[PDB]
Amino acid sequence: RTNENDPAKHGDQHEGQHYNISPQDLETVFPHGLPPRFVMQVKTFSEACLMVRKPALELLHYLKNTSFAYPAIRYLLYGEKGTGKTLSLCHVIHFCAKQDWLILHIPDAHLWVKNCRDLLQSSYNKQRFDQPLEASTWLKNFKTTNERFLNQIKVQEKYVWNKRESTEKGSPLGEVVEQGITRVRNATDAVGIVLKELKRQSSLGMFHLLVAVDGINALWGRTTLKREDKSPIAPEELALVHNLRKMMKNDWHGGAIVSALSQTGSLFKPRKAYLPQELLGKEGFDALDPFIPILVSNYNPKEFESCIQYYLENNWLQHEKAPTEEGKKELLFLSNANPSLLERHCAYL
Amino acid sequence: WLIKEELEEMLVEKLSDLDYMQFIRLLEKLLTSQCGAAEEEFVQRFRRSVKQLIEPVQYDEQGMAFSKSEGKRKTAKAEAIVYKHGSGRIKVNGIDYQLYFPITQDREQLMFPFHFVDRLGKHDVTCTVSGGGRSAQAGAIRLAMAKALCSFVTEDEVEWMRQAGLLTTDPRVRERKKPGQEGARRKFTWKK
Ligand SMILES: Nc1ncnc2c1ncn2[C@@H]1O[C@H](COP(=O)(O)OP(=O)(O)OP(=O)(O)O)[C@@H](O)[C@H]1O
Ligand SMILES: Nc1nc2c(ncn2[C@@H]2O[C@H](COP(=O)(O)OP(=O)(O)O)[C@@H](O)[C@H]2O)c(=O)[nH]1
Ligand SMILES: [Mg+2]
Structure with a gap:
């Protein structure tokens, strides 16, 4: 594994070499968004080693060479199912977190467009619907991730949560975050206000902002949610989706936008769809273009050998014949070097 | 030994199995008696005379060597082109095997021949399959790939593959439903 555990210093020489992430960093940075299987692996091994791969290295280099004066650049982690797109996004997220950026991290947009039972028409705007449970769940993890930067932000307007309760210009954004977390009915509006304030303050220069959205195609893929009349609900009608589209719009600077495509959890998309236009539709492609x-x-x-060596070092491959080159070749063939399939295979060996 | 029918044809006489057995036992005794050439040629009047085939290697546009084969399983039919060199990459209908066969069982079925002959990663393959389900297609592709690989592996390896069953077309196919019964063999619940 790499003796270089710094997310910013590791370079091409560390390709195919591991990279540790301390438990304190994991708690402070990833309350959400890690793949469930990787979370289970972390809990099992008491470690969070990620392999330094070429896509993550390239995206890190782009972010390092960025110029915040220009409008936020949109990068799109892309490719096949279970190739490490989400973990590459997590690697970039950890790098920026250690670089002291405000990480607006959406762990999975897909969760916001299905299974919601608390869906309600938004009081602030009857045209749109709110998702209080998801809003509060995201807000809690967002506060846990970026508490230190949260106090510094000065809100620029007066936001009324009721005819009697409001938050005033010059107040910390922690006030709005806490209001959304506590008063569940106002969580969606709090999320919208937070997105607005972060987007504008990044341009003002208050802080560097990294938007990091997984499953970005969900922002334009059809939703499975239904109205009271059993009628389908378009993606934009959700307040969270609307505000996240506004955030994805590149009309701002002082930051960068990284989105990761994900067929997994997508709605109305074939399994073998891994191209950007195919996953995003034409609407989403033009929106992100x-x-x-x-x-x-x-x-x-080399990456395959490194991952196998990590598993052997952890003794995860308890199978007697796994260390043998015959077993190594069998695993290589069965997973065809796909990280997700290889992990699932080694899960029961 | 000529069957009783052949003996009857030769003797223009009807015979019983017991008579034929007696005659055959006498002939066996004659042969075992360490007889001469005249007796052996006389016995020849009554004596009656009773491996996998390898496809030919071909050369592609670049001249690189390959072999072609076909196989069938259930309703599935597949044709495989196995090249002499590669990184174990198998493209089914132009799709990589790991994406065409999400089932680890079918991926194992694809692996089986190369693993048997110790050639994991030593060849590339392009296969075209149709009909049948996922498992039928996997079996048909396995059979086609094994038959093609016979073009490269040694004769000992070919015989070992046959003995392992990689080169036998599985005759097991669906059995027609018969009238008056639920399925191929499931009779209706006997009423009382
Ligand atoms: N760079 C990496 N370092 C360590 N493990 C990785 C890496 N990339 C993939 N993996 C392994 O594969 C899984 C992570 O894959 P990930 O969740 O990123 O899939 P994905 O392909 O981006 O998309 P999806 O599976 O949602 O289609 C985990 O089990 C992890 O162990
Ligand atoms: N309840 C409430 N929500 C607000 C307020 N200001 C902004 N928001 C949130 O942000 C959205 C408004 O965003 P804005 O940039 O004004 O554009 P709009 O969404 O098109 O009206 C609302 O729908 C809320 O989600 C406010 O004063 N009250
Ligand atoms: Mg993923």
């Missing part, structure tokens, strides 16, 4: 796609593919031989 222009953007820089970053491909993530199956492990190269």
